[PDB]
Ligand binder design. Structure first.
Ligand SMILES: [Cu+2]
Ligand SMILES: [Cu+2]
Ligand SMILES: [Cu+2]
Ligand SMILES: [Cu+2]
Lengths: 288, 285
C-alpha cells in the first residue's frame, strides 16, 4: 500500500518526463526487450499443448499473469528511478471525448501520437518515434519503427466506454469453465474482451493498431503497459467489490491456469499476486 | 554439496526406474513443457537483436544458462521425488566403444534406443518411445514422436573423445570477444563446440540426431539433460583447475555479462558460478 499508480492524465509534466526517460533507459540497457520476448513466448505456451489458451492470454491466467508482468516491469523502472511508478491509461474516459485521439496521453511529451499515414502509419511524434526507438519482431529481430493507426478498423472504431467497464464489474464469477475465450458469465473473459469481441481489453488493442493491434508484438509499444495497468486497476476494483469471490479455477483447469500453478515463463502463481496491495502498490483511486 | 549427480552408468536399477518415472510425471503434469518452451524462447532472444548470439547458446552465457536450466530441472524432479537427482551422460567414455549405441544409457531400462530405420528413425524402445512420449515443435504445438539417428551425418559420425575434453580444459580464458561462434582461445566456445565444429557439445547433438539434432527442439529428448549435466560437470571441473572466472565482466552484449539477467530468468551468471553453493555435486568430486 505504498507505491501509487496514477492516472496518466493526472501526472505532472515532470512525472511524465521521468517515466518516459526511464523507459528509454530500460530500452537502451537491453532490459525492455526481455518483456517483449517474455510476452511472445507466453503466447506460444499453450495450456494444454495444442489448445487455444496460452500462459498469458485467452484463459484464466490472463489477469494475474499481466499483474506479475507489470510488477516486474515496474520493479525494473524503480531500479533506474525509485520515484517512478507505472501509470494507467483510463481509456474509458478518453472514449467519452469528442475526439479521443486528442487525449493528452498522445502528446509529444509522453507516448507520442497517431501513425503517419504517409509513412505506413509509423509514429513520428513523441519519445518513441521512428529513429529514436526500434521495435522487435516475433523472431527477435529488429522490425522497424513503432506503428499506430487509431480507430481504423471496422471491428474496433472506438475505445471501450465506462458503461462497458461498469457492466463487466457486475459479473460475479472471476472465470467459468471451459476457462477459455468462450467462457460465459466470466469477468476475466469479459474484461479480456472475447464476449462478442473485440470488447474492452481486446478492443483497446485493435483500436490502437500497429504493433498494439497484434498481441504477440503488442509490447513493442510502451502504451501496452499503460493499457494493462488500466486493466489491472479494473481487476483490482472487481476484487474490492466482490470481496467474497476468488480466483478460478482453484483446481482441475489446465496446468498453468489453476490458482497454485506456476505462470510460464515464471514460477509465480495466481495466488502469489492475488492481493495487489501485498505486492506493494495501490491505484490512486483507492486513496480518493 | 549435498545432492550427488551420479554417472548414468553407475546408477542402480531402482535409480534408473526412479529417474525415468519422475521425468514421465513431470511430462504428465505439464512441467516438462516449460523446459521445452523456455529453451525455444531463449533461442529467439538475440544479444543484441539481429545478431546470432542468443541467450542460451552461441555466446558466453552458454555455460551458466544451462547450469541454471539443469538446476531448475532438478528442483522440479526433487519436488516430485526427493531421491531423484540429475545423472550425467559421460559420452567421452562411451566414445571408445566401437558402437556407442550399445551403451547401457540406451537400454529399454533408461532412454531407450536408436531410431528405427524402417520407421523414419522413430524411437520405438524404452519409456520415451512413440505412443509413450509426445513431442512439441518450435512453434509450441504437438509434434509426432521422438526420433534418433546415431552418427548418421558425415560431420558428426563419432561421439567426442576424452582427448577432446582435455584440449578444452587446457584453455585458460573462459571466453573472448566477440563472444560468438568465432571466439578463439575460448573454453566456452570450445566446450560448446564451434571451433572446427561440430565439436564436443555441438557434436553430441549432431551425433544423436532427431530432435537432439536441432538447437531449439533438442530438449524434446530427455537425453538432453543427461548430456548437459555432463557439460556442466566438465565446466565444474574446469572451474577447479582454472580457479579463474567468467568473461565478459562488462561491456559485452547485454545478457552475456557477469551480472546480466539470463533470459528467460533473472538469474545471473554470477548467481550460478559455484555449483556447490547451488546444493549439488557430481560423483568423483
Ligand atoms: Cu499480454
Ligand atoms: Cu493486452
Ligand atoms: Cu540448450
Ligand atoms: Cu545442448
Amino acid at each position: 500500500k505504498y507505491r501509487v499508480r496514477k492516472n496518466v492524465l493526472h501526472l505532472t509534466d515532470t512525472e511524465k518526463r521521468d517515466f518516459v526517460r526511464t523507459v528509454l533507459i530500460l530500452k537502451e540497457k537491453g532490459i525492455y526487450d526481455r518483456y517483449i520476448a517474455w510476452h511472445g513466448a507466453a503466447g506460444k505456451f499453450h495450456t494444454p499443448p495444442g489448445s487455444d489458451r496460452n500462459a498469458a492470454h485467452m484463459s484464466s491466467a490472463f489477469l494475474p499473469w499481466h499483474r506479475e508482468y507489470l510488477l516486474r516491469f515496474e520493479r525494473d523502472l524503480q531500479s533506474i528511478n525509485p520515484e517512478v511508478t507505472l501509470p494507467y491509461w483510463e481509456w474509458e474516459t478518453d472514449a467519452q471525448m469528442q475526439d479521443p485521439s486528442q487525449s493528452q496521453i498522445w502528446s509529444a511529451d509522453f507516448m507520442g501520437g497517431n501513425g503517419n499515414p504517409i509513412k505506413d502509419f509509423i509514429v513520428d511524434t513523441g519519445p518513441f518515434a521512428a529513429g529514436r526507438w526500434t521495435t522487435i519482431d516475433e523472431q527477435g529481430n529488429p522490425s522497424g519503427g513503432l506503428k499506430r493507426n487509431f480507430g481504423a478498423t471496422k471491428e474496433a472504431p472506438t475505445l471501450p466506454t465506462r458503461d462497458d467497464v461498469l457492466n463487466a464489474l457486475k459479473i460475479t464469477q472471476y472465470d467459468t469453465p471451459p476457462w477459455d475465450m468462450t467462457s460465459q458469465n466470466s469477468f476475466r473473459n469479459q474484461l479480456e474482451g472475447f464476449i462478442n469481441g473485440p470488447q474492452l481489453h481486446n478492443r483497446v488493442h485493435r483500436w490502437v493498431g500497429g504493433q498494439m493491434g497484434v498481441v504477440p508484438t503488442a509490447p513493442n509499444d510502451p502504451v501496452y503497459f499503460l493499457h494493462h495497468a488500466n486493466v489491472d486497476r479494473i481487476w483490482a476494483v472487481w476484487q474490492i467489490i466482490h470481496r467474497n469471490q476468488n480466483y478460478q479455477p482453484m483446481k482441475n483447469g489446465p496446468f498453468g491456469q489453476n490458482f497454485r500453478d506456476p505462470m510460464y515463463p515464471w514460477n509465480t502463481t495466481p495466488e502469489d499476486v492475488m492481493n495487489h496491495r501485498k505486492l506493494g502498490y495501490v491505484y490512486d483511486i483507492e486513496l480518493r
